[PDB]
């Protein structure tokens, strides 16, 4: 499929940026997570980034660490995540779905088999957080064999060689990191380095989504203005889950309000 | 692109977030430069001699082997400043940190020995040290925590995940991901992403180099085998390195068997785990069926790696080194035996290596064999553990 | 009649019951013979090198003395096997016991370090060791008691008198009075009846001999002063001995001042006691007005002699050595300072010597002085004492 | 004075041995100790050996260790001991009184001063337990200047040189040790080595008293038969004190019975 390509073409036609929430699958349980995801979509999410709970999420700060822990407390496994993903796709045929993976979960049952399962359930992209471009060959090859976009990361400090590799090897979107460090709303990054955004376009990279520390509408607007195709927000969304664990209905209302506001900021 | 090979056969690599690659490349560059720099080498040698107390003795056991054809020597890393071999490589890494112009050190620790080693090196060499330690480890390692604090290190409990060593490893990397411009991550074993397995081996290889010179002096020949315990792999690779090209010398690594391999309560991933990718490397590890990382169990907290250094996995794969396991009970018996027959109190970690040597001797008492056990540390820390049993 | 002079000026002698005189004469004879025997010397040197880890390092402090004209080195007896200098002389006395054909060892201990040293030497060398320890000391030194037991020694609590070190000294002598035909009394310091002050000095003198060679190598000249703590006097006389004839080298012994000399709660008999006769010798001691023997108080249990070796009293009397005191609080500050600025955890005993060197530097920071402190032991044992404060 | 010489002459006239109990002064208190001592004398003690409580009695086994401790519990000091000694002598003008001392108590206030005090209260001998003949010069000189007999010890193993020194330097009596070790009734020694007893006589030593482990009449008789002038018993006497602490009247009755039996054994 070509779900990101179709999305970005549609958004470009409307001079609009993408807003892309992240949540952990199965946080705080399978049924509530499915409701959360439906709420994100109804509230205007253009695409999703979905984490499979992992024991050792070493690119994540405390907010998302705690989401992984809640999912484990609910007994969530990768197999259950795939069941969730198949159902999400059955409900929502066009929204791009990206996974946030750690390498061991991809390598565990065999790399090729993992990407084959992604294709079967209708995932569009996979970002393996602890595989740098230097180690990426078997992952990107398997992704492409199964019509999955492999997502690569452009750090703010990226040199020309790295920009060329990310441009060549990635598909779907290019992840533009706002800053060093780990995920977290408590730590705001920079405006998309215009120089990086322009070099990526020069090298015909997949459209850029800025992520890390994106918690406010004003940051979404600024990302798009700087030339990114959109913005990803994780911790800010997950914080709403955490705050409202005891109040599942209020949780969905607050998620809807927040996502609506973030998506509004992406519009021309 | 790297200067050195990041792999040992299929094992090893640099499985870190993209943001950390410049830090690993910088470290590799600084290490390659340092290894060719006679001034760096002289400074390292000076600290090892005059501060740490190298060379360490090579002690012939005679009482333990009486009535057999085994001759057993112990390489006395228990006599190094700090009481374990860890001191060697922390001094080298502290000097690398300074070479790169870094003023801060991050370290992980489980049992606390690496934390103490890191704090002592940082105190000596004017570095600001922060140490991550799983909250469960903090609770059970009060002595080591107090030592770290006395030496001016910040000890930061880690409550995420299982609140043990792997969680502290993660936290150290999360910190470094944001702080690498000013801080060096002083990794505590011959594992993690390249270049750490290589650096740690090179900064521990004096163990084997000295052993070779000492055994040649005393016996006029090389050992039939050298035997070392394997947590993450540093003391073992430090003993093995200078013998790898001496094809006649057996290399035997001893993983903790815990309550017994069959119980699943062990720390023997090399022989009884499954290859995975975690903590920056492709290596055998303790993992669930689905690929979640698990803990290693041993009576010895210091053998509490849930994986193993990639060079050990490689040496095993090609048959150059053999790996075995020793249970809690076997280690305890070796501890008691060394205390009573040689007047040396060994670390429970090291007791695993000694236990396997004792088995080699006892199983085949008329086999002529010259063995060296790496006595990686002293066992003062373990007397209450052993007492309670 | 004796072969060697039992006195140092008026101090020393052989104040034992008549029944023990043959044992002391036999010991003296065996010692004089051993000192001329190249085989005995070679065996002792071999144990010191290959078992105990001599020579010990001489470490230059630079961080501690920054901004002053003091240069400070530490003689690292903390790195000897066992963690204190006591190991040197127990190995020598164990070899004497064997030379005399004895198979059993009696020892006294207070803090437990001498007991552990005696037990380790006895385990190595095939001797049956029994250790007397005041019941109050047994209660408060569980770690050391367990170490002694692990090494196969019998630990015998002494409930008589004050149930502390002097009482254990008495009990050891009472046992020897009946058992001297088969047992050697392994006295733990440079005190007691002749020939012990002499033997212990000679079996500790490698401390000063090495220090001299090391300082000449590093500085091209002798120290301005060497500084050592004084419990019974062994580590201090071992450091001092080879410098006694180097008239330019100051010899400074540091007694424990406890809560302060003025409080009476101290262990400083050389400077603040009164000459008496006890434990086989004429020497300054802690005694009541009527002549009953008293205890020494110090935060450091190892400085818990209620007297001092006669050679120290003599060197003081002729002005060849100067003796000073350091309080609990001064020792604690030195402990903390060394941990934080040099990454070395010193014994609280040794911390008294370091504290006095720190005072020498701080009081007169523009005085050019090259100082050596004997770091008699490591302070792992003391972390909980220091913690609780 | 010449109290030992007079005693031994009187005993020789009757072909009789001496029986000499030891007790610790002030055990279990001053008043009871004075009563104990009067009882010993009335029951037939020929001489006394009296210990001054010392902190570190390193020639004594547990029985006498515990006597020293009881005296300290009663606050007994050397000055109080001297007061006791003056009164004992005022009551009993001819009985030889020997002290069992440790060196520090003699050296404490000055050696000469100690022996001067002994002369003033009427003590006859002093045995300093931890001063061997080799260290004895200032002690024996001060003793003789103050008409006090210095007592020396002949171990069972004594060589000829030692026998000659003990014979020359001692006065009053020669102490013949029954065995190595420390005081105690639980450990019986040998018969007086006839060879030692005869050599001492050859060298004109002061008459021999055998001590250590002497607890029974049969041992007293045997000592005298072997050629000793008598026998000393300490622990056996002190054990009666210890056993009867709660019963002071019974204590005196048992002491009387025991001493009477021991003295009877010395008679021809
Ligand atoms: O809004 P924040 O700060 O929580 O950021 C949310 C990011 N979620 S994600 O899945 O895009 C994401 C993307 C990349 C990550 O690590 C890597 F860069 F190393 F690959 C981790 C998470
Ligand atoms: O009957 P026992 O076994 O208790 O012996 C009692 C002895 N009491 S004593 O005062 O004669 C006495 C005599 C000598 C002593 O020691 C010495 F030999 F070293 F000098 C100790 C006590
Ligand atoms: C830490 C430690 C070990 C295990 O670590 P390695 O990296 O495998 O050497 C072994 N022995 C001692 C004494 C230790 O402190
Ligand atoms: C026992 C001890 C001392 C004191 O004894 P000395 O005989 O005076 O040396 C000093 N330092 C340490 C570390 C000790 O263990
Ligand atoms: Cl592309
Ligand atoms: Cl005479
Ligand atoms: Cs052998
Ligand atoms: Cs392991
Ligand atoms: Cs200086
Ligand atoms: Cs002292």
Domain positions in chain A are: 1-268
Distance from the Cα of residue B100 to its chain's centroid: 24
SS3 A50: strand
Quote the tokens at residue B106.
């991050």
The closest of C189, C298, C187, C186 to C233, measured between CA atoms, is: C189
User: Quick check: CB of C77 below 6 Å from ligand 4?
Assistant: no
Q: What is the spatial distance between Cα C99 and Cα C119, in angstroms, rounded to a whole number?
A: 18
C-alpha gyration radius of chain B: 19
Q: What is the spatial distance between Cα B120 and Cα B124, in angstroms, rounded to a whole number?
A: 6
- Identical fold, C8-52+86-204 and C53-85+205-389: yes
Beta strand ranges found along D5-45 (DSSP E): 18-24
Q: CB–CB of C268/C261 below 8 Å?
A: yes
Q: Which residues in A122-139 are b (16+ Cβ under 10 Å) and which e? A: bbbbbbbbbbbbbbbeeb
**Which A residues, 109 through 148, put their C-beta within 8 Å of a C-beta on chain B?**
109, 129-135
Q: What is the spatial distance between Cα D249 and Cα D39, in angstroms, rounded to a whole number?
A: 11
Q: Which residues in B168-207 are b (16+ Cβ under 10 Å) and which e? A: bbbbbbbbbbbbbeebbbbbbbbbbbbbbbbbbbbbbbbb
Q: What is the spatial distance between Cα B234 and Cα B302, in angstroms, rounded to a whole number?
A: 12
Distance from CA of C1 to the nearest CA of D (A): 7
User: Quick check: CB of D211 below 6 Å from ligand 2?
Assistant: yes
How would you classify the pairing of strands C104-109 and C128-134? parallel
Total Cβ atoms within 10 A of residue C215: 21
Strand order in the sheet with A18-24: A149-150, A125-128, A97-101, A48-51, A18-24, A230-233, A208-211, A174-177, A153-154
User: Quick check: CB of B377 below 6 Å from ligand 3?
Assistant: yes
C-D Cβ pairs (cutoff 8 Å, strict): 97
What residues of B are in contact with residue A108 (Cβ under 8 Å)?
276, 287, 290-291
Closest partner residue to C383 (CB to CB) among B123, B147, B340 is B147
D189 near C CB under 8 A: no
Q: What is the spatial distance between Cα B129 and Cα B103, in angstroms, rounded to a whole number?
A: 9
Q: Under an 8 A CB cutoff, do C383 and B146 touch?
A: yes
Instruction: Tell which atom from ligand 3 comes closest to the C-alpha of B303.
Output: 4
C-alpha gyration radius of chain D: 17
Ligand minimally distant from the alpha carbon of residue B200: 3
What residues of B are in contact with residue A134 (Cβ under 8 Å)?
1, 14, 21
C-alpha gyration radius of chain A: 17
**Ligand 3 atom 13: the closest Cα is on which residue?**
B377
Say whether B81 is catalytic: no
Q: What are phi and psi for residue D96, nearest 5 degrees?
A: -65, 135
A-B Cβ pairs (cutoff 8 Å, strict): 97
What residues of B are in contact with residue A154 (Cβ under 8 Å)?
18
> How many CA atoms, within 13 angstroms, populate the side-chain half-sphere of residue C155?
28
CATH for C53-85+205-389?
3.40.50.1100
Say whether B229 is catalytic: no
Closest partner residue to B287 (CB to CB) among A61, A104, A182 is A104
Quote the tokens at residue B229.
């315990």
Quote the tokens at residue D214.
């002497």
Distance from the Cα of residue A193 to its chain's centroid: 20
Closest partner residue to D130 (CB to CB) among C15, C178, C290 is C15
B205 near C CB under 8 A: no
D31 near C CB under 8 A: no
DSSP conformation class of C205: T
Solving technique: X-ray
Distance from the Cα of residue A161 to its chain's centroid: 25
Q: CB–CB of B321/B129 below 8 Å?
A: no
Quote the tokens at residue C164.
């502390």
CA of B92 to the centre of ligand 3 (A): 17
Q: Under an 8 A CB cutoff, do B150 and C51 touch?
A: no
Q: Tell me the domain boundaries of chain C.
A: 8-52+86-204, 53-85+205-389
Q: Which fold has domain C8-52+86-204?
A: Rossmann fold (3.40.50)
What residues of A are in contact with residue B292 (Cβ under 8 Å)?
54-55
Dihedral sign from CA coordinates of B283, B287, B293, B296: negative
The closest of B302, B308, B319, B309 to B377, measured between CA atoms, is: B302
User: Quick check: CB of C346 below 6 Å from ligand 4?
Assistant: no
Q: Which helix (DSSP H) or strand (DSSP E) does residue C96 occupy?
A: helix C86-99
Q: Give the angle C260-C264-C269 at the CA atoms, nearest 5°.
A: 90
Q: Under an 8 A CB cutoff, do A58 and B161 touch?
A: no
Instruction: Tell which atom from ligand 2 comes closest to the C-alpha of D238.
Output: 4
User: Quick check: CB of C350 below 6 Å from ligand 4?
Assistant: yes
Those residues with Cβ within 8 angstroms of residue B105's Cβ, 6 or more apart along the chain or in another chain: B94, B97, B118, B121, B122, B127, B128, B129, B130, B183, B184, B185, B186
Those residues with Cβ within 8 angstroms of residue C324's Cβ, 6 or more apart along the chain or in another chain: C252, C253, C254, C255, C271, C356
Q: What is the spatial distance between Cα B300 and Cα B111, in angstroms, rounded to a whole number?
A: 9
Quote the tokens at residue C101.
């054909």
Residues in the 5 Å CB sphere of ion ligand 8: B 267, 296, 305
The closest of C169, C187, C202, C184 to C4, measured between CA atoms, is: C202
Which chains form contacts with chain D, at 3 or more CB pairs under 8 Å?
C
Quote the tokens at residue B200.
């740690």
Q: What is the spatial distance between Cα D99 and Cα D79, in angstroms, rounded to a whole number?
A: 14
Q: CB–CB of B156/B199 below 8 Å?
A: no
């Amino acid at each position: 499929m070509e779900r990101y390509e179709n999305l970005f073409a549609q958004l470009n036609d409307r001079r609009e940026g993408a807003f892309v929430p992240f949540v952990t699958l199965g946080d705080p349980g399978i049924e509530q997570s499915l409701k959360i995801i439906d709420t994100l979509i109804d509230a205007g999410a253009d695409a999703l980034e979905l984490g499979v709970p992992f024991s050792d999420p070493l690119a994540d700060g405390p907010t998302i660490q705690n989401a992984n822990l809640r999912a484990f407390a609910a007994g969530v496994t990768p197999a259950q995540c795939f069941e969730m993903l198949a159902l999400i796709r059955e409900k929502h045929p066009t929204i791009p779905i990206g996974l946030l993976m750690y390498a061991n979960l991809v390598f565990n049952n065999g790399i090729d088999a993992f990407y084959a399962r992604c294709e079967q359930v209708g995932v569009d992209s996979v970002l393996v957080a602890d595989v740098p471009v230097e180690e990426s060959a078997p992952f990107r090859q398997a992704a492409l064999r199964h019509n999955i976009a492999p997502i690569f990361i452009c750090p703010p400090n990226a040199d020309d060689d790295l920009l060329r590799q990310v441009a060549s090897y990635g598909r779907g979107y290019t992840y533009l990191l706002s800053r060093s460090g780990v995920t977290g709303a408590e730590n705001r990054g920079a405006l998309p380095l215009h120089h990086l955004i322009e070099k990526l376009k020069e090298y015909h990279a997949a459209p850029a989504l800025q992520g890390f520390g994106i918690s406010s509408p004003e940051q979404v607007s600024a990302a798009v203005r700087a030339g990114a195709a959109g913005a990803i927000s994780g911790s800010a969304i997950v914080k709403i889950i955490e705050k409202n664990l005891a109040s599942p209905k209020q949780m969905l209302a607050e998620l809807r309000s927040f996502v609506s506001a973030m998506k509004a900021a992406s519009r021309a | 692109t790297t200067l050195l090979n990041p792999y040992f056969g299929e094992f090893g690599g640099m499985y870190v977030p993209q943001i950390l690659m410049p830090a690993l490349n910088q470290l590799e560059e600084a290490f390659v430069s340092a290894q060719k720099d006679p001034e760096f080498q002289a400074q390292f040698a000076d600290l090892l001699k005059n501060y740490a107390g190298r060379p360490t003795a090579l002690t012939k056991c005679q009482n333990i082997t009486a009535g057999t054809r085994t001759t057993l020597y112990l390489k006395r890393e228990d006599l190094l400043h700090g009481g374990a071999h860890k001191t060697n490589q922390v001094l080298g890494q502290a000097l690398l940190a300074k070479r790169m112009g870094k003023s801060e050190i991050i370290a992980e620790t489980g049992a606390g020995q690496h934390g103490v080693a890191s704090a002592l090196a940082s105190a000596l060499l004017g570095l600001k040290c922060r140490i991550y330690m799983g909250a469960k480890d903090v609770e059970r390692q009060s002595p080591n925590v107090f030592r770290m604090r006395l030496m001016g290190a910040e000890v930061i409990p880690v409550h995420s995940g299982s609140a043990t060593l792997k969680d502290a490893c993660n936290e150290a990397l999360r910190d470094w991901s944001g702080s690498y411009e000013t801080a060096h991550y002083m990794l505590g074993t011959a594992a993690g992403p390249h270049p750490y397995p290589t650096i740690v081996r090179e900064f521990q290889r004096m163990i084997g180099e000295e052993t070779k010179a000492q055994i040649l002096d005393k016996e006029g020949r090389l050992p039939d085998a050298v035997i070392a315990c394997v947590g993450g792999g540093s003391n073992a690779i430090g003993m093995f390195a200078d013998f790898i090209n001496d094809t006649s010398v057996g290399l035997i690594g001893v993983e903790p068997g815990g309550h017994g391999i069959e119980t699943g309560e062990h720390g023997a991933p090399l022989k009884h785990g499954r290859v995975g990718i975690y903590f920056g490397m492709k290596a055998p590890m303790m993992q669930t069926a689905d690929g979640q990382i698990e803990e290693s169990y041993s009576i010895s907290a210091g053998l509490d790696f849930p994986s193993v250094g990639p060079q050990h996995a490689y040496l095993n794969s090609i048959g150059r080194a053999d790996y075995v396991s020793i249970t809690d009970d076997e280690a305890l018996e070796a501890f008691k035996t060394l205390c009573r027959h040689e007047g040396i109190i060994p670390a429970l970690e090291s007791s695993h290596a000694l236990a396997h040597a004792l088995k080699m001797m006892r199983e085949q008492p008329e086999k002529e064999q010259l063995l060296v056990v790496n006595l990686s540390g002293r066992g003062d820390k373990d007397i209450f553990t052993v007492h309670d049993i």
